[PDB]
C-alpha cells in the first residue's frame, strides 16, 4: 500500500482527496504541468515554488535521448529536474498514437522508471483515437490489458492503469472493471485529447461517466490531456482528480492566452481580464512586441495561474456545496460544453448515489438546467409520498407545490429561485408533524414511528428545535437545513423501528469497543452498510448481531463505505456507552 | 464643451467611450472608488497608481469639517487628497436619504464645489427609497428638479443631474426627459442603493432601461453605488458608463471577500479563488492571523483588483462582440441576477435600437435565454417576409429553418449551437437570388427592386460576390458576413427605389460638399437620419433636398447620429463628386 487516498471533502461525483505516495502528500482535485525536458519553458523549480506539488514528464523522450538518459540515471529525475514533489511519467504513449509506434519493450520502460526514481509509473496502454473501427479498439484493448498483467507482476512502484475503450462505451466499462480488479493505485482515462481539442466535450463525459460507472470509487482518477481550465469545472464533477497540461507551455509558445472560458490570441486582446502576476503588470499591446522568449515565458506563467486560479475556484465551490452552479456558469463558455453538461445533467442514477444529502449553500436555480440537478430530482420524487400522507402543500418556486411539512427542510426552505418562498412555521399543534415528515423524507418510508409520541419543543422563533419524550432528546432539528441530528435515544428507536439493513454501518468486532466509545468509524473497519446511505446522512453504527454501537454521520455512501480502505466512514456524535 | 463623450467601440446597449473633463481623459466603462476624507483604507495616491483615474469623494462631510474645509480651500481637493486625476463629489445628498436632511443650501454647497477645484460637481438630488409612495416620489422629485433648475443656472463646472423617481418606470422616463433636455454632462441614476443591497436586481433593470430611454444618448449614464462586480457586465449591457464603489473597502472592513459571482467571508474561505498580488502571495489562514488593520488594507485591494479585472472583462468581451455571452455568464451567479437577465431580454425594442446590424462574432447558443438575445428576436423577424417569398427552407439549430437564400448571412452562417449548421452554397441560378434575399433582409422591404437585373460573381468557390449592372458595380457580398457593402451606384438604385427618410442620413450645407469628395461624415453635421439605421448599416448620405451626396457605413444608429455632437457618424466609402 504505497498510495493512499480518501475524501475529504465532496459535492455532486466530485471530491477533494487527500493522496500519498510514499510519503508525499497532494490534496486532490490537482494539475500536474508537463514538463519537456530537452526545452523547459517553466523551471521544475519554479513549477514547484509556484505550488505545484505533481508533474509529468515523458520517461520514452529522456529514455531515447543519450543526454537525457545518462543524466536520468546518473542522478535520478529528481535531481535531474531539480524537483522535491510527485513526478509522474508518461511512456511517449502520445508517440504510440501520433506515431502508431514506439520503439522499447513494455518490460523495459518500466524497467528503466525505477531505476530513475519515478514516483508514479505507466506501462504502454495504447490511446485509440476517437471513433475506431470497433475491431481495431478491441485489439488494442486486449494489448493493453496483457500488457497491463505483466506490468502488475513487475511493478515495486505505484502505477497508473488507463482505460482505454476509444469511443466504444462497452469497451471502457470493460476495460474499467477489469482494471479495476487488477492492483493499480491509479486510474487515468485515455484517449481523449484527441475530443478535447475538438471541443467535443459530450463525448468525453459519455466516456468518463461510463468509466466511472465500472470503477473502484477509491482510487484516483485521470483525465489524460486535459489541461484547459474551461473543462475543470465539469470534470471534477464527474469524480475526476487528477488532470495534466502541456498546453500552458504550448499555447504560450503559439501566443494563446488561457482563460477559464476559452482561449485566446495575443493579437485578439485588448485587454487582460486576469490579475495574476503576469497580467497585473503588463499589458496585451506590450507582450505582443516583446521578445519571443519573454512573451513565451510570461504567457506560460499567465496559463500557469489560470490553471491554478480555477482548481482553487472549484474546490472553494466543492467546500460550499456550489459545484454545481460553477459548472453551470462554465457550460456557458461554449455550446458544446453546454450540450456536454446537459448531457452529463441526465446521468441522473450516477450522480444521484453520491449527492451528499445536505450542502452548506442554499439551492439556487440560476438556469432551467439547475431544475434537472440532483439535488432537485431527489427531493421531488422523495416528497411524493409525504405530500399526499400530510397534504397541506403550499407553492413553492422551484418543486411548485410541497407540504408545509417540509417546508422548513433543505432543499424547500434552503433554496432560492427568481421569486421568494415563504417559510411556514409551525403551531404548537402541528409541531410534531413536522418532525414526522422530516423523519419520513430523511430516514424513509416508517420513519415518523420513531417519533410519534415525542414532544417538540419551538425557540423564541417559532422554528422546530428539541424533539424529546419521557425522559431526553431524541434529536434535534437543525437550525441551518432543517433536518435531524440524532440523539442516541433517537437512533435506538430507529433501530427497532426500521428493519435491518436500514441506516446501518455494520462494523468489524475490532472496531466495535471504539464505536461504543463514540469515536468516529474508518472506512476500513466497515464490513456491510445499507447501499441507501447518502454522505452526511444520518447513520446507525451497529455490530454483525445489528445492536447498536453509535450513532453519527456518513461521510461516503453506504457502497464507497465498503470499497474504502482508508480515510473516515462516520463521523460519530454519540456512543451506546 | 466642459465635457466631451464619444463611442469608441459596442456591443448591445454597451459602449466603450472616451470621457474627457479639464483635459484629463479616461475610457469608460469605468469604475471610481469613494474616498473618505475622514478615513482612507487606500490613500488616493495609490489608488491612481493602480490606475483608477477618477474617484468620487462626499462634499458635505468635507463642507463641514473645519479641517478638511480649510484645507479644501487652501489647496483645492485635488491638492489636499494628493490626486492629479479626474475628482467628482457627491453633493452629500446621500445622507438626505440615511437623516432625511442636511444643513446646507443648494446654492451654498455649489458653489463651495466650483471653490474647491472639483472635476465633476453635483446638485442636492433627493434619493427617495425604493418602494415610497406615489407622493413621495413625486414630491421629491419636483424638488430634485428645482434644485436641477437653480444648477443649471449658476453652474460653472460639469455636473451630474441625478435620475430620481423610486421604482415608478414613468416618474424616471418624466425626469430623465426633463434633465436630458437641460445642459448637465453626466446623468447618474439614483434611489438604486438599497435594491442592490437587497439583491433585487430586477428592479434595477426596470429603472435603469425606463431611464435609458428617454435620455440623451450622448451622455454618460452611472449607476449610483453600484460597486459589486456582480453587477457589471448587466448595467453595461444596459448602456452604464459608470460605476462607483465604497464596497471594496467596507467589505475589507467586515472581513467580506468580492467576487464576479458574490461575495465571500474570509472565516468562510479555505482557498482564494484569485491570482491578484494579495490572493496569490496569501492564503486565507494567512490573512485571518493578520491584525484587523493590515488585513482590512489586504481586502481592499483584493476588492479593487477584481473590480479592475471585472471592468477589463467587460471590455475586452465588447470588443470581441461578445458582452451577452459573458452576461449569461454572470447571470448564473445568483437566482435573482439570473431573473434580472431574463427581464433585460424582455426589452427587445429599446435593446435592438443599438443591437449592431454585424458582429465579428459568431452566434453562440449557451442557454435558452440566448435563443432570445436581440440579434435572433431581429433576424427571426426580418427573415418571414424572406422565408415566406423565396422559400427554399433548411434547418437550423437556432432559427429552426431559414431560406437557403440567407444561410450564408450574419447570423445564419457563422451560428453554432449543441449542432453545426451546414450552409447551403448558391448555384448559378441562385446568384442574383441569393443577393435579392440579402437586400430584402439587409435594406428592408423592397430592396430587391435595386437588384433585378443584375450579375453576380462567384469567388473562386461559389460564393456570391461584386453585384454589377452592364459594367457597373451595384454591391458587393462581403465575406465575413453575407452582407452587402454598397457601391456608389447601387446606392442610387436604392436612393430611387426606397422612400425617404429610408437608409438617410441628412447633413449640413457646410459638410454636403465634404461629403460629395467622400470625406467622412462627423457626427455634429448630421441633422437627421433615419430611425431605423443600426450601426454598421449601409446609410445613403443626402442633404436637405434628398439629394445623394454619397454612400458609407454607419457607426452609430440613427438617432445616435442626430444627438452626438463628437466622432464619426458614417465612415463614407465613396462620394458622388
Ligand atoms: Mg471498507
Ligand atoms: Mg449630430
Ligand atoms: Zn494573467
Ligand atoms: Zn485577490
Known amino acids: 500500500?504505497?498510495?493512499?487516498?480518501?475524501?475529504?471533502?465532496?459535492?455532486?461525483?466530485?471530491?477533494?482527496?487527500?493522496?500519498?505516495?510514499?510519503?508525499?502528500?497532494?490534496?486532490?482535485?490537482?494539475?500536474?504541468?508537463?514538463?519537456?525536458?530537452?526545452?523547459?519553458?517553466?523551471?521544475?523549480?519554479?513549477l514547484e515554488k509556484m505550488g505545484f506539488e505533481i508533474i509529468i514528464t515523458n520517461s520514452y523522450i529522456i529514455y531515447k535521448d543519450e543526454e537525457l538518459r545518462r543524466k536520468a540515471l546518473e542522478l535520478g529525475i529528481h535531481?535531474?529536474?531539480?524537483?522535491?514533489?510527485?513526478?509522474?511519467?508518461?511512456?511517449?504513449?502520445?508517440?504510440?498514437?501520433?506515431?502508431?509506434?514506439?520503439?522499447?519493450?513494455?518490460?523495459?520502460?518500466?524497467?528503466?522508471?525505477?531505476?530513475?526514481?519515478?514516483?508514479?509509473?505507466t506501462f504502454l496502454d495504447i490511446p485509440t483515437p476517437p471513433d475506431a473501427p470497433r475491431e481495431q479498439a478491441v485489439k488494442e484493448l486486449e494489448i493493453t490489458l496483457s500488457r497491463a498483467r505483466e506490468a502488475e507482476?513487475?511493478?515495486?512502484?505505484?502505477?497508473?492503469?488507463?482505460?482505454?475503450?476509444?469511443?466504444?462505451?462497452?469497451?471502457?466499462r470493460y476495460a474499467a472493471r477489469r482494471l479495476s480488479s487488477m492492483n493499480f493505485e491509479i486510474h487515468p482515462i485515455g484517449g481523449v485529447v484527441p475530443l478535447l481539442e475538438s471541443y467535443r466535450f459530450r463525448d468525453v463525459v459519455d466516456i468518463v461517466i461510463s468509466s466511472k460507472m465500472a470503477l473502484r470509487p477509491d482510487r484516483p482518477v485521470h483525465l489524460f490531456g486535459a489541461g484547459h481550465p474551461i473543462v475543470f469545472a465539469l470534470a471534477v464533477a464527474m469524480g475526476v482528480d487528477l488532470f495534466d497540461s502541456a498546453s500552458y507551455a504550448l499555447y504560450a509558445k503559439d501566443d494563446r492566452y488561457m482563460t477559464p472560458e476559452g482561449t485566446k490570441r495575443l493579437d485578439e486582446l485588448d485587454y487582460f481580464p486576469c490579475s495574476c502576476p503576469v497580467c497585473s503588470k503588463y499589458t496585451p499591446q506590450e507582450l505582443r512586441e516583446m521578445?519571443?522568449?519573454?512573451?513565451?515565458?510570461?504567457?506560460?506563467?499567465?496559463?500557469?495561474?489560470?490553471?491554478?486560479?480555477?482548481?482553487?475556484?472549484?474546490?472553494?465551490?466543492?467546500?460550499?456545496?456550489?459545484?454545481?452552479?460553477?459548472?453551470?456558469?462554465?457550460?456557458?463558455?461554449?455550446?458544446?460544453l453546454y450540450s456536454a453538461y446537459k448531457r452529463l445533467l441526465?446521468?441522473?442514477?450516477?450522480?444521484?448515489?453520491?449527492?451528499?444529502?445536505?450542502?452548506?449553500?442554499?439551492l439556487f436555480k440560476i438556469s432551467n438546467e439547475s431544475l434537472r440537478w440532483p439535488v432537485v430530482r431527489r427531493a421531488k420524487e422523495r416528497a411524493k409520498s409525504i405530500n399526499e400522507r400530510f397534504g397541506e402543500l403550499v407553492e413553492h418556486p422551484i418543486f411548485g407545490r410541497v407540504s408545509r411539512y417540509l417546508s422548513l427542510t433543505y432543499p424547500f426552505a434552503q433554496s432560492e429561485a427568481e421569486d421568494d418562498f415563504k417559510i411556514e412555521k409551525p403551531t404548537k399543534e402541528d409541531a410534531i408533524k413536522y418532525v414526522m415528515a422530516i423523519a419520513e423524507y430523511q430516514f424513509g418510508e416508517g420513519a415518523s414511528r420513531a417519533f410519534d409520541d415525542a414532544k417538540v419543543e419551538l425557540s423564541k422563533t417559532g422554528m422546530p428545535r428539541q424533539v424529546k419524550v419521557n425522559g431526553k432528546r431524541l434529536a434535534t432539528v437543525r437550525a441551518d437545513d432543517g433536518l435531524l441530528t440524532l440523539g442516541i435515544e433517537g437512533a435506538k428507536r430507529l433501530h427497532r423501528v426500521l428493519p435491518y439493513p436500514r441506516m446501518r454501518v455494520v462494523?468489524?468486532?475490532?472496531?466495535?469497543?471504539?464505536?461504543?466509545?463514540?469515536?468516529?468509524?474508518?472506512?476500513?473497519?466497515?464490513?456491510?452498510?445499507?447501499?441507501?446511505?447518502?454522505?452526511?446522512?444520518?447513520?446507525?453504527?451497529?455490530?454483525?448481531?445489528?445492536?447498536?454501537?453509535?450513532?453519527?454521520?456518513?461521510?461516503?455512501?453506504?457502497?464507497?463505505?465498503?470499497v474504502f480502505q482508508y480515510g473516515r466512514a462516520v463521523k460519530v456524535r454519540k456512543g451506546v456507552e
Do not use: C
Open 79 to 121: 535531481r535531474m529536474l531539480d524537483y522535491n514533489g510527485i513526478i509522474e511519467v508518461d511512456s511517449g504513449s502520445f508517440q504510440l498514437m501520433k506515431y502508431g509506434s514506439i520503439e522499447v519493450s513494455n518490460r523495459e520502460i518500466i524497467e528503466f522508471q525505477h531505476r530513475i526514481g519515478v514516483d508514479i509509473g
Open 1 to 46: 500500500k504505497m498510495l493512499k487516498f480518501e475524501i475529504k471533502a465532496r459535492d455532486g461525483a466530485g471530491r477533494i482527496g487527500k493522496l500519498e505516495v510514499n510519503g508525499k502528500k497532494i490534496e486532490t482535485p490537482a494539475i500536474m504541468p508537463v514538463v519537456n525536458p530537452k526545452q523547459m519553458v517553466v523551471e521544475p523549480k519554479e
Open 346 to 362: 441526465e446521468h441522473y442514477t450516477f450522480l444521484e448515489e453520491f449527492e451528499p444529502i445536505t450542502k452548506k449553500s442554499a
Open 507 to 562: 462494523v468489524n468486532k475490532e472496531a466495535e469497543p471504539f464505536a461504543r466509545k463514540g469515536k468516529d468509524v474508518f472506512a476500513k473497519f466497515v464490513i456491510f452498510a445499507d447501499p441507501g446511505i447518502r454522505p452526511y446522512d444520518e447513520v446507525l453504527v451497529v455490530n454483525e448481531n445489528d445492536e447498536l454501537l453509535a450513532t453519527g454521520q456518513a461521510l461516503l455512501s453506504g457502497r464507497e463505505m465498503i
Open 153 to 172: 507482476e513487475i511493478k515495486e512502484i505505484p502505477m497508473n492503469a488507463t482505460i482505454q475503450g476509444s469511443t466504444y462505451t462497452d469497451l471502457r
Open 291 to 336: 521578445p519571443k522568449e519573454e512573451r513565451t515565458r510570461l504567457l506560460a506563467l499567465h496559463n500557469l495561474w489560470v490553471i491554478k486560479e480555477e482548481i482553487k475556484r472549484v474546490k472553494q465551490a466543492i467546500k460550499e456545496g456550489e459545484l454545481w452552479r460553477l459548472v453551470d456558469e462554465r457550460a456557458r463558455s461554449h455550446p458544446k
